[PDB]
Design a protein around this nucleic acid. Structure first.
Lengths: 203, 42, 98, 190, 174, 79, 62, 141, 108
RNA sequence: AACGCGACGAUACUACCCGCACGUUGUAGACGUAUAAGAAUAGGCUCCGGCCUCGUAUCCUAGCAGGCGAUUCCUCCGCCGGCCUCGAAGUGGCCGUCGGUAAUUCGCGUAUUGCAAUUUAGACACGCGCGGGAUCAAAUCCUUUGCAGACGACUUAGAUGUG
RNA sequence: CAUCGGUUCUGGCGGGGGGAUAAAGGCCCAGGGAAUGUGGCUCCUCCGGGAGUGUUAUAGCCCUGGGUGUAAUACCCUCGC
């Protein structure tokens, strides 16, 4: 348990309902949550089941006027996750609206979240929750098949972001190597009494 | 080379073995013995 | 699609400057007067960097084009301005073309 | 019942190279290289002996044990493909209108294209594009015969299936109208 | 069904003028406690020997503890269970360290596989398979195999449920 | 079928109070009726049910039959 | 009748587009482009070559 | 016929395998009950590493690199103790990196307020030395 | 100069009142203390006093900052959430607002 | 989308920008509110030696809420300027100046808030002030138009003109 | 804040009793036995390991009786701090 200013969560490899439940509980407790890469979220079960559920959702509409009151079907994966979270929050109250004001959802990783730490939720991770051999699908694939238009744009922006991250990781590896060499070289100039004192303390 | 004719014409298929996932648990001699006490008991 | 920037010409006609006004006859007609000084200051460095920004960041290039309404018999003096897409070539070719 | 340990065995010929990393099998031979991703099946690969590959499943069900047989046959098919290859001989027959079959190689794709004309007098030109790695020739030994050859059995057989399914007789009695292209022989190139 | 213990329950009919020394009947009962053990004892007596609790008494109740709880054993259980079709024999095998552990495993097994409750199961005999050759079921035969050693693929790591967020993606290899 | 692309009207699992009460009433009436039919049943019933016996896969069935035989001979000798 | 959305009609139209109308439209586009070519041709920070910055939020305010 | 295979090499539960439990103690597998439970005994003379003979679920345990060679299946506490002392399981466990991490964790948990202040000051002095070394290294290249 | 902090309290969040499914009881609040995740850790903070610090509009007696005072009464549930009783019930608008758990009265 | 967003033009004032000078100004709630690989999970990471349950980690962390003066060190931080760089809702790198700075040690001051009483201390937005720098705009009514029209609304035109 | 009274929640510690005077188990003593057969011996090999023999050897295990022993510990009950 720890309180943070804002928690950024990589949505890749997470199960939709479990991540939504944890995020809704954190928002109502008072923590600001940002979720990125909602296109890479997972849903358990084989893809045609999720597709059929989305088409059953698309069936529902106000008969007398489709411009008011009806289910407005948002096709973006971030908005699918937002609908999942909003179903678990008393959104028609002032407290629920304030709790929903503490959430931001995106597709891909826009700046400045590209240079921020992205945490994961092990209670919602697909590789830790699903039994091996069980089928799963991708919310981005579902969105593309139900009418989301920007799958290719997000993919291009993601590959540019990962190229820049590869350059950053190369510099990071160089810095880590130089730091290890600096520690090894400075181990001679450090006072030995300080050395076994820190070793006895555990540092 | 293969001397026989496979019925579906897939001549590259290997000589398959019986699907026996419980193979090797019980020896043959013990099974013969257990057949003998089974017959006597019946 | 999102408009990153636009670049205008140094001289705009009165009939296209009329489009930016509702009371052009009472106007001081100051439109684009400070913009026209950007062509003269620093040999158009701001115009050049906006052109380079369109060259290196953008994928769709459209010209802005207006009609010469004074050659028509219409009593309207305020011209019509629209965006026309440049199709074909690379983005640098589109920018140089415009 | 959950079986503690189950295992299958694949021998490898001496001139064949097998590389397995993250369940992505690459099999190289005299005729070339084939590659298949098998990461949808839970299996542990090992080298139990020189020239022998072992496949094992731990604590799997009967279905998971049975999947290893499919993996074994698939890898053996790639081995046979890179060693001896796969060859499908097809025959095209007709009653009145001769079937004109043109075989060409598209340069920018690298794939072969088979054009079929005059199928029961039709004016349309049917065009079938082969899978990459499938080579099609018109046989000179026998009459009205195509020969499809390659390393990938799935590619060769799917190309032959496409050639059959493009020349389908519609709205006619099939006991009377016998024109078409049919796979007549399946085997190895070597 | 529950933390069970095995009880020796000996009971008898109340002595009368005609029968001054009535016969003693002994059963081994698996029960959570002695009240349940005596209740099952009188239920089986009313089912078998027509001796009711009103005209009977309990001579002795003792606990039969396991002789070697630290030795791994194979147990064969012969049971009858009641379904809507009727009463069926079953023989099952359990690899445990005590008879009570085998009986609770049997109860959980019957609840899982046939939806049978405690009241519908009659444990007719629990025996220890003296030899490896006495094992009949393949799911015990594969465990009693020579040189049994196996890995544990895809082990989900234990993370406390109070730690909501993790900074690294977990591994499933140890 | 075209279920995935074009699903139909969903079948509701939400029960209604009227139907739940009706189902409970009919279940109770059926249970009372089958008690009445079992009471007025003319179908023949045996006094003693057929015991299934000892399963063959029990490893000590022959020994158990040995104590059965020995106990019956002992009872015959005592009587 | 075959509808406008029919796959065979789409393939017929694709063959027409590739083999018949395509070269004609390409030649027309070439001529029009040539005419409009005739009309059209008729430090880094201090020079603008280095693209510097011009002279609702995605984050929480901090 | 040369074959390159890159796969996962798990540690295997087997007789003689030493398990580390959740309380930090050690045990050795004597008999395997099933795929989820084993029979394990820790005869170590160290009270921190000792474990009574009994059933250990494999979920509640971890696998150490240490394997006792030729430990007989079903061996009682005397034989397991003889094998443990002959093989020197305690020294090898102390050599492993899990025990070093656990020792560091205990040392950090046992610090008092004065100890934490001294840790901060000595770490700042060592940090001064390491900062000079890193500046020298970055100056070169 | 020194660049350390000056915090001597523990952060907490006001989750809710004591409640059933429907009925709530403002006289008792539920507090989530940071780093406290079970009853064993919650037992340390019993009897510790807790401040809800907020801001008002008017400046009264030299400040615009008001405090509601309370104490931690008992653990709640299994996950280290504690029950707290204050001089006045906390505002319902403050569900999720931060509170300060001080280390006094100390038993160390 | 009339409570979604972008680019551009001209922006008179008490309008705009810069500096500091503060708010009985506000905000679902600062108190170290520090931390970017990607990818796989029947496999990965590496400095190529080895390493991988584990963030129970790493950084930062002492001084009147943190003074003054030294001893000592060339370490860390910050504002600016230059050159580059960063378009998914645009900001970081290097160099240079200037300022601050216990890694070591010491000297003078702390009291009296009286045995606790939020530790009034942060960020953003808004407002009122000066002292400076920069700029002199539009819309509507009205008349008119008929590409429009129930009324509003809309297309036009009204400043010297191809009116 | 300290010292108390009433009610109540929660943590730890020191003893007593019972059972098969727990059952186990450690170390000894005396018998008996087997294999998922240790060592040894024989035969095959891909030289990695398999097959056969049999009763402790260069591992051990199971069963019965006895001692330590009124052993420890679990569980249940109970006296207090």
């Amino acid at each position: 348990s720890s309180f943070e200013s804002v928690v950024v969560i990589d949505g890749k490899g997470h199960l939709l309902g479990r991540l939504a439940s944890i995020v809704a509980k954190q928002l109502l407790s008072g923590q600001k949550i940002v979720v990125v890469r909602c296109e890479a979220l997972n849903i358990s079960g084989e893809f045609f089941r999720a597709k059929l559920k989305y088409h059953a959702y698309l069936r529902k509409m106000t008969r007398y006027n489709p411009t008011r009151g009806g289910p407005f079907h948002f096709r973006a994966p971030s908005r699918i996750f937002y609908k999942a979270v909003r179903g678990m929050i008393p959104h028609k109250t002032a407290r629920g609206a304030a709790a929903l004001e503490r959430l931001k959802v995106f597709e891909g990783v826009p700046p400045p979240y590209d240079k921020k730490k992205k945490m994961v939720v092990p209670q919602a991770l697909r590789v830790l929750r699903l039994q091996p051999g069980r089928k799963y699908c991708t919310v981005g694939r579902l969105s593309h098949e139900v009418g989301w238009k920007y799958q290719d744009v997000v993919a291009r922006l993601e590959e540019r972001r990962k190229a820049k991250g590869a350059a950053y990781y190369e510099r990071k590896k160089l810095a880590a190597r130089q730091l290890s060499e600096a520690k090894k070289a400075a181990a001679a100039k450090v006072d030995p009494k300080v050395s076994e004192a820190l070793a006895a303390y555990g540092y | 080379k293969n001397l026989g004719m496979r019925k579906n014409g897939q001549v590259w298929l290997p000589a398959k073995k019986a699907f026996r996932p419980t193979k090797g648990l019980t020896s043959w001699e013990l099974r013969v013995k257990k057949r003998q006490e089974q017959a006597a008991m019946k | 699609l999102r408009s990153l920037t636009t670049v205008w010409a140094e001289h705009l006609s009165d009939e296209v400057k009329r489009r930016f006004y509702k009371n052009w006859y009472k106007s001081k007609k100051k439109a684009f007067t400070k913009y026209a000084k950007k062509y003269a200051e620093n040999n158009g460095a701001s115009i050049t960097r906006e052109l380079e920004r369109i060259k290196k960041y953008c994928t769709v290039v459209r010209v802005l084009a207006h009609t010469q309404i004074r050659k028509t018999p219409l009593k309207q003096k305020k011209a019509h301005l629209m965006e026309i897409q440049i199709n074909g070539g690379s983005v640098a070719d589109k920018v140089e073309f415009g | 019942m959950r079986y503690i340990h189950s295992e299958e065995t694949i021998p490898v010929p001496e001139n064949v190279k097998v590389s397995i990393k993250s369940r992505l099998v690459t099999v190289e031979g005299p005729r070339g290289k084939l590659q298949k991703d098998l990461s949808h099946i839970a299996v542990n690969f090992s080298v139990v002996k020189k020239g022998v590959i072992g496949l094992e499943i731990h604590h799997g069900s009967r279905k998971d044990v049975a999947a290893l047989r499919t993996v074994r046959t698939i890898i053996n098919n790639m081995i046979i493909g890179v060693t001896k290859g796969f060859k499908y001989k097809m025959r095209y027959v007709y009653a009145h209108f001769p079937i004109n079959v043109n075989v060409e190689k598209n340069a920018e794709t690298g794939c072969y294209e088979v054009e079929i004309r005059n199928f029961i007098g039709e004016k349309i030109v049917r065009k079938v594009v082969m899978a990459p790695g499938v080579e099609v020739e018109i046989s000179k030994a026998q009459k009205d015969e195509l020969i499809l050859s390659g390393n990938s059995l799935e590619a060769v057989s799917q190309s032959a299936a496409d050639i059959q399914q493009i020349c389908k007789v519609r709205n006619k009695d099939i006991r009377k109208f016998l024109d078409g292209i049919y796979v007549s022989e399946k085997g190895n190139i070597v | 069904m529950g933390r069970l213990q095995e009880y020796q329950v000996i009971g008898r009919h109340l002595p009368t003028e005609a029968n001054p020394n009535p016969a003693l009947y002994r059963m081994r009962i698996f029960a959570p406690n002695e009240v349940v053990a005596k209740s099952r004892f009188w239920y089986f007596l009313r089912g078998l020997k027509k001796v009711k609790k009103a005209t009977g008494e309990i001579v002795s109740v003792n606990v039969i503890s396991e002789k070697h709880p630290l030795k791994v054993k194979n147990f064969g259980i012969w049971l009858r269970y009641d379904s809507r079709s009727g009463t069926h024999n079953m023989y099952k095998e359990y690899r445990e360290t005590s008879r009570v552990a085998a009986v609770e495993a049997m109860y959980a097994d019957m609840a899982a596989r046939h939806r049978a409750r405690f009241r519908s199961i009659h444990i007719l005999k629990v025996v220890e398979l003296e030899k490896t050759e006495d094992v009949k079921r393949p799911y015990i035969k594969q465990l009693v195999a020579k040189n049994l050693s196996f890995p544990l693929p895809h082990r989900v790591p234990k993370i406390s449920t109070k730690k909501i967020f993790s900074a690294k993606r977990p591994s499933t290899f140890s | 079928a075209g279920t995935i692309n074009k699903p139909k009207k969903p079948t509701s699992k939400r029960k209604t109070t009227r139907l739940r009460a009706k189902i409970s009433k009919r279940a109770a009436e059926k249970k009372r009726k089958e008690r009445k039919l079992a009471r007025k049943n003319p179908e023949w019933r045996s006094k003693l049910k057929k015991d299934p016996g000892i399963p063959n896969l029990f490893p000590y069935k022959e020994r158990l039959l040995q104590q059965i035989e020995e106990e019956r001979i002992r009872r015959k000798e005592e009587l | 009748a075959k509808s406008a959305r029919a796959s065979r009609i789409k393939e017929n139209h694709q063959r027409f587009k590739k083999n018949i109308a395509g070269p004609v439209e390409a030649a027309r586009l070439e001529r029009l482009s040539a005419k409009l070519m005739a009309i059209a041709q008729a430090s880094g920070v201090k020079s603008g070559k280095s693209i510097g910055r011009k002279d609702s939020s995605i984050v929480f305010p901090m | 016929a040369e074959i390159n295979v890159e796969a996962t090499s798990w540690r295997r539960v087997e007789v003689g395998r030493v398990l580390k439990l959740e309380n930090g103690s050690l045990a050795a597998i004597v008999e395997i009950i099933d795929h989820k439970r084993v029979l394990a005994d820790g005869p170590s003379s160290d009270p921190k590493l000792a474990t009574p003979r009994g059933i250990v679920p494999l979920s509640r345990a971890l696998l150490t690199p240490i394997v006792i060679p030729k430990l007989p299946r079903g061996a009682r506490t005397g034989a397991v103790k003889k094998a443990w002392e002959a093989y020197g399981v305690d020294a090898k466990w102390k050599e492993t990196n899990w025990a070093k991490k656990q020792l560091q964790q205990e040392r950090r948990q046992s610090l008092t307020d004065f100890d934490r202040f001294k840790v901060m000051r000595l770490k700042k002095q060592r940090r001064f030395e390491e900062r000079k070394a890193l500046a020298k290294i970055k100056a070169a290249a | 100069p020194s660049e350390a902090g000056h915090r001597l309290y523990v952060k907490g969040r006001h989750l809710s009142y004591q409640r059933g499914r429907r009925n709530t009881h403002p006289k008792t609040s539920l507090i989530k203390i940071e780093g406290v995740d079970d009853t064993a850790a919650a037992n340390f903070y019993l009897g510790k006093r807790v401040a809800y610090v907020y801001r008002a509009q008017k400046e009264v007696r030299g400040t615009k900052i008001r405090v509601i005072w309370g104490k931690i009464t008992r653990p709640h549930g299994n996950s280290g959430v504690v029950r707290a009783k204050f001089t006045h019930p906390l505002p319902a608008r403050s569900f999720g607002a931060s509170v300060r758990i001080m280390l006094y009265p100390s038993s160390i």
